[PDB]
Amino acid sequence: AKRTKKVGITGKYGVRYGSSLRRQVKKLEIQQHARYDCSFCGKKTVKRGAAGIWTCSCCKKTVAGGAYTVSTAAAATVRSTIRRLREMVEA
Amino acid sequence: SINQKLALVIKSGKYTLGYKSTVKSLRQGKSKLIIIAANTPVLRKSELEYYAMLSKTKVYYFQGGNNELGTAVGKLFRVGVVSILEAGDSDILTTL
Amino acid sequence: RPRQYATVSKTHKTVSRAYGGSRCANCVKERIIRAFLIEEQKIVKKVVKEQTEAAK
Amino acid sequence: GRVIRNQRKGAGSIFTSHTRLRQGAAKLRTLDYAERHGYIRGIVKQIVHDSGRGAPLAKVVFRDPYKYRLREEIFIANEGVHTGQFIYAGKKASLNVGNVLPLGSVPEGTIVSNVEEKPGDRGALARASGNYVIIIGHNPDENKTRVRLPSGAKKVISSDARGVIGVIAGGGRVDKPLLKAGRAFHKYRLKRNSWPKTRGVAMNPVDHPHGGGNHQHIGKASTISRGAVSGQKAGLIAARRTGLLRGSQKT
Amino acid sequence: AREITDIKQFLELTRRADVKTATVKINKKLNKAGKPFRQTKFKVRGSSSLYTLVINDAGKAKKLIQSLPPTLKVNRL
RNA sequence: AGGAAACUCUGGUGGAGGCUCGUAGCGGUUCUGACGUGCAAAUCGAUCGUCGAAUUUGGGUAUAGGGGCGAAAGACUAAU
RNA sequence: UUUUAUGCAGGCCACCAUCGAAAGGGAAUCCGGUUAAGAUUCCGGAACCUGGAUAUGGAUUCUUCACGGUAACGUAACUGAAUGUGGAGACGUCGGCGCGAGCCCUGGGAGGAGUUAUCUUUUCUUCUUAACAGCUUAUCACCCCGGAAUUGGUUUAUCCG
RNA sequence: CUUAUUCAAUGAAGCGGAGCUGGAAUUCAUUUUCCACGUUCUAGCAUUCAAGGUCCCAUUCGGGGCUGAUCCGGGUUGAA
Ligand SMILES: [Zn+2]
Ligand SMILES: [Zn+2]
């Protein structure tokens, strides 16, 4: 049915550790347990093996990344600015 | 645009999806054109390029993924490749 | 176990193909294709380079 | 009185880092000929968790140009690398992720990691999770590059000093809590025997310079001169200010 | 300790010339309720293994022992 | 299943937790019980704590005396 | 060099000692019986590996270093130095699911024993088959065909195309 | 300034200089100097003093030198 109002995956942690830390942990546990999309194949077979090891079962690939998400926004900015200055330099 | 012309071909012309049926058609020469996704194995990509070089067929690279091309043709699964055998109605063969 | 591999004969240890008991057959396929394709690519790259810089 | 904890950590019998589950050092290939006259290709074959570290590593493979062999290296993975990947490393290489262009070659506003400090130390700067170094400017005549370090520090280092392009992986790690002495236990037991930390003010005065008293109180101020000694350097050392800071690092 | 079916194989085995000993076992057996038969078992012994030629025909068994050499030391049981 | 939609609920599966009851086990609260020239140079009994782990443990191995080790009692370092 | 040593024509390579676990890794054995006291160690039988000589048979070849199969791959074998590459060794913990072994429960029948004033086609008991060898057998995986929305297959657990 | 001292690598491999071969340079006379001086769609592969070309040998089973791979100095390379 509907089990939990707002603890979600942080109901295994029970009544411990404080609501705020449980909120943060909730957010990041969702991020890290979720399935993502392998860019090489588009399929939803991407998962964490370990912190910044994000591997795809279907296409048998592995990409390095954030401990809890697979693409961190900082590194996204870095990709973009790298492409920018590289285009400029070859240009 | 391109997805509109491809839907027109889905309605009027005929086609076959996927690497195996595609390259079978290309071996037979019956095909005219291929559209190829951009998420794609570069090996498969280059092999198709060679096959189409031999067949003198045309090739087009899709600014999209398997998902996007599938939505374009109107199917609901992954399509890295599509082979146009004839369009009848569309300007696909003429344009690009 | 390894010493038992040393007991048995060749038939029980590998396959009649190139890369018999080392690599998957599908991987054999893949890498053969890779070789042929990119050496052809190398060749056409070489000749286009030669002719454009010969013009130039 | 008695010898104290740091004063034993120097000798290091039980405080040596643990090593069983590490793949060895992560290092940059030697600046031999190619990386200072051209470039070389390598294949990222796999990516692997290293224990005790927080980042992952990249098992990369090059070919020794002098001998028919395949020389393997362990790199740090930046975010955006993957398996089966072609990593071009050297001077005449390309400005993408994974590559090892010199700081003399890269432009301003650039991001790098695993940066050398002097050419042939093979990875010193910004090796930990999510830490990057930014380029500032050059003085190619008397070849030097200004770089900003995650402490905000503007350092000046040579130009042949290599450095990997990208941001180090495993970011966001300390954004998560731990919630558990057990989680911290596991962390520090794969790193080194550094936990739990017990308070000197709860120790006895023989065992620390805070210990003792009918009330847990320090008594004598904890701001310690830099020119103190081994036995006195418990507390805040060479400190300029204390307390809550409100405002800016101001640099 | 290997089964054997080919009779000429068993004979050239008897003349393998490392072979020295042989045995013939009889066994009381059942094909069906009313014909409990007589299984013959020629167990020949050389060096590295024992070869067991199996037989379920007394006519063939007597022809076999008629065919065997005399010098090969036998054990009837 | 409901709802105009937003989105809400119901039954099931499933089997998480430094969760819990509780045996083995590790411990050692209370009885301030027994004994207290003992079975014992620290035990016996009942009652108790905890029991998948920051767990318990063998073996090897390192740290040696103003030194070591210490989740810290000035505790332990062969009844010291 | 066949006076001979290993000088000697040649090229290769590059630990950089050693010690360290009778519970980690590890080449190879099982049954039966046997003594006052031994046993996987003895006896009988049947096996396995290692090392080294090694001869017969067999296979290959006058197209010199095998053939069949679309393929996955198969076979009694069926050249292969230097060097290099890969794999096994070699690996957590918990859950439940399946499968197997032995045990337990049990039916019939063949023997033996017990009870029996009464009743009990009854209670108990034996009915076994090792290492090793040959033939055969499998979940997962993999190949051929063919081309899937009307979406389908499928696990206890929802994953796949 | 490097040599003394000090730091670090490395199986002490490509140092430095000059030079070809090209691009730019304005050559104000001939080059004035500067850039390069074999590699980038792809998880392949790269080894036998290198094949070739070339000069010899004793052709024979083959054997050897130059180039292929510019030359000189023998400061391993940087730092300080
Ligand atoms: Zn994928
Ligand atoms: Zn494979």
UniProtKB/Swiss-Prot annotation, chain A:
GO CC terms, sorted: cytosol; cytosolic large ribosomal subunit
Transmembrane segments: none
Localization terms from the record: Cytoplasm
Keyword entries, A-Z: Cytoplasm, Metal-binding, Phosphoprotein, Ribonucleoprotein, Ribosomal protein, Zinc, Zinc-finger
SUPFAM superfamilies on file: Zn-binding ribosomal proteins
Matches recorded under InterPro entries: Ribosomal_eL37/eL43, Ribosomal_eL43, Ribosomal_protein_eL43, Ribosomal_zn-bd
Any GO MF annotation of the entry: structural constituent of ribosome
List of residues that carry Phosphoserine: S39
Keyword Chloroplast: no
Keyword Cytoplasm: yes
GO biological process, one term: cytoplasmic translation
More info: Present with 44600 molecules/cell in log phase SD medium.
Assembly and binders: Component of the large ribosomal subunit (LSU). Mature yeast ribosomes consist of a small (40S) and a large (60S) subunit. The 40S small subunit contains 1 molecule of ribosomal RNA (18S rRNA) and 33 different proteins (encoded by 57 genes). The large 60S subunit contains 3 rRNA molecules (25S, 5.8S and 5S rRNA) and 46 different proteins (encoded by 81 genes).
Family: Belongs to the eukaryotic ribosomal protein eL43 family.
Protein name (Swiss-Prot/TrEMBL): Large ribosomal subunit protein eL43A
Swiss-Prot record, chain B:
Pfam families with a match to the protein in the record: Ribosomal_L7Ae (PF01248)
UniProt entry keywords in alphabetical sequence: Cytoplasm, Isopeptide bond, Ribonucleoprotein, Ribosomal protein, Ubl conjugation
Gene Ontology terms describing biological process: cytoplasmic translation; negative regulation of mRNA splicing, via spliceosome; rRNA processing
Keyword Cell membrane: no
GO molecular function terms attached to this record: pre-mRNA 5'-splice site binding; RNA binding; structural constituent of ribosome
Covalent crosslink: Glycyl lysine isopeptide (Lys-Gly) (interchain with G-Cter in ubiquitin): K14, K45, K75
Alphabetized InterPro entries for the sequence: Ribosomal_eL30-like (IPR039109), Ribosomal_eL30-like_sf (IPR029064), Ribosomal_eL30_CS (IPR022991), Ribosomal_eL8/eL30/eS12/Gad45 (IPR004038)
Compartments where located: Cytoplasm
GO cellular component: cytoplasm; cytosol; cytosolic large ribosomal subunit
Major localization class: cytoplasm
Keyword Magnesium appears in the UniProt entry: no
Family membership: Belongs to the eukaryotic ribosomal protein eL30 family.
Subunit and interaction comment: Component of the large ribosomal subunit (LSU). Mature yeast ribosomes consist of a small (40S) and a large (60S) subunit. The 40S small subunit contains 1 molecule of ribosomal RNA (18S rRNA) and 33 different proteins (encoded by 57 genes). The large 60S subunit contains 3 rRNA molecules (25S, 5.8S and 5S rRNA) and 46 different proteins (encoded by 81 genes).
Misc note: Present with 59300 molecules/cell in log phase SD medium.
Protein name listed in UniProt: Large ribosomal subunit protein eL30
Organism encoding this protein: Saccharomyces cerevisiae (strain ATCC 204508 / S288c)
Gene behind this protein: RPL30
Curated annotation (Swiss-Prot), chain C:
Subcellular location: Cytoplasm
Miscellaneous comment: Present with 23600 molecules/cell in log phase SD medium.
Function per UniProt: Component of the ribosome, a large ribonucleoprotein complex responsible for the synthesis of proteins in the cell. The small ribosomal subunit (SSU) binds messenger RNAs (mRNAs) and translates the encoded message by selecting cognate aminoacyl-transfer RNA (tRNA) molecules. The large subunit (LSU) contains the ribosomal catalytic site termed the peptidyl transferase center (PTC), which catalyzes the formation of peptide bonds, thereby polymerizing the amino acids delivered by tRNAs into a polypeptide chain.
Subunit comment: Component of the large ribosomal subunit (LSU). Mature yeast ribosomes consist of a small (40S) and a large (60S) subunit. The 40S small subunit contains 1 molecule of ribosomal RNA (18S rRNA) and 33 different proteins (encoded by 57 genes). The large 60S subunit contains 3 rRNA molecules (25S, 5.8S and 5S rRNA) and 46 different proteins (encoded by 81 genes).
Family: Belongs to the eukaryotic ribosomal protein eL34 family.
Protein name: Large ribosomal subunit protein eL34A
Lineage: Eukaryota, Fungi, Dikarya, Ascomycota, Saccharomycotina
Gene name tied to this protein: RPL34A
Included stretch of the parent chain: 58 to 113 of 121
Curated annotation (Swiss-Prot), chain D:
GO cellular component: cytosol; cytosolic large ribosomal subunit
PROSITE patterns listed in its UniProt record: RIBOSOMAL_L2
InterPro entries, alphabetized: NA-bd_OB-fold, Rib_uL2_dom2, Ribosomal_uL2, Ribosomal_uL2_C, Ribosomal_uL2_CS, Ribosomal_uL2_dom3, Ribosomal_uL2_RNA-bd_dom, Translation_prot_SH3-like_sf
Sequence position, cross-link Glycyl lysine isopeptide (Lys-Gly) (interchain with G-Cter in ubiquitin): K45, K92, K118, K144
Entry-annotated residues carrying Phosphoserine: S51, S94, S158, S159, S248
Keywords: Cytoplasm, Isopeptide bond, Phosphoprotein, Ribonucleoprotein, Ribosomal protein, RNA-binding, rRNA-binding, Ubl conjugation
MF annotations from Gene Ontology: RNA binding; rRNA binding; structural constituent of ribosome
Main location: cytoplasm
Cell location: Cytoplasm
One example of a Gene Ontology biological process annotation: maintenance of translational fidelity
Gene3D superfamilies, per database record: 2.30.30.30, Nucleic acid-binding proteins, Ribosomal protein L2, domain 3
UniProt similarity note: Belongs to the universal ribosomal protein uL2 family.
Function field: Component of the ribosome, a large ribonucleoprotein complex responsible for the synthesis of proteins in the cell. The small ribosomal subunit (SSU) binds messenger RNAs (mRNAs) and translates the encoded message by selecting cognate aminoacyl-transfer RNA (tRNA) molecules. The large subunit (LSU) contains the ribosomal catalytic site termed the peptidyl transferase center (PTC), which catalyzes the formation of peptide bonds, thereby polymerizing the amino acids delivered by tRNAs into a polypeptide chain.
Protein name (database record): Large ribosomal subunit protein uL2A
Source organism (scientific name): Saccharomyces cerevisiae (strain ATCC 204508 / S288c) (Baker's yeast)
